[PDB]
Write a protein that binds this ligand. Structure first.
Ligand code: FE
Ligand code: FE
Ligand code: FE
Lengths: 54, 54, 54
C-alpha cells in the first residue's frame, strides 16, 4: 500500500501503522479511511493529502 | 446497491455518494454503515429507513 | 468468530451481537473493531481484552 503525505504539515500516513488512536487500524489503505478523518497534526481533511510516489 | 430512504423526513441514502462528512464513504452499502449513524437531516436512526425498491 | 472478554470488568464482546450503539455492527471480528473503541462497561481499551478460548 502507498504512503500519503499531508501537504499542509508534512505528516505521513503509513498504512502499516494506521492511526489507531483515531480508529484507523494498521493495514488500512488511505482510500478506505473514513472521509471525516483529519490529519493528526494539522487537523486538515483528506483532500489535502497526496500519494507518496517512489 | 440499493438506495434507502428515511421514512421520517424523506432523505435518500445513495450508496454511490455515501455520506462522507459523517465518515460514510462512497460505495458503502447501507447494511455496512455503522449502526450508530443517523439521518443527516432528521437525526433518526437506521431503523427508520427502508429500501427504495423499483 | 471468537468471543473476547474485558479483563478489567468481565464484559464479553460477542461478534454475533457486535456493539451497535457504538458503531460496531453484528458480524464484526474483534480484530476489525476500530482501535479507539472502548469497553461499554468499564471504558478501557482493546488492549485489556483477551480471547475466550474453549
Ligand atoms: Fe497535516
Ligand atoms: Fe431523516
Ligand atoms: Fe470492561
Amino acid at each position: 500500500m502507498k504512503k500519503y503525505t499531508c501537504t499542509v504539515c508534512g505528516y505521513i500516513y503509513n498504512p502499516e501503522d494506521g492511526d489507531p488512536d483515531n480508529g484507523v487500524n494498521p493495514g488500512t489503505d488511505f482510500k478506505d479511511i473514513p472521509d471525516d478523518w483529519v490529519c493528526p497534526l494539522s487537523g486538515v481533511g483528506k483532500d489535502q493529502f497526496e500519494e507518496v510516489e517512489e
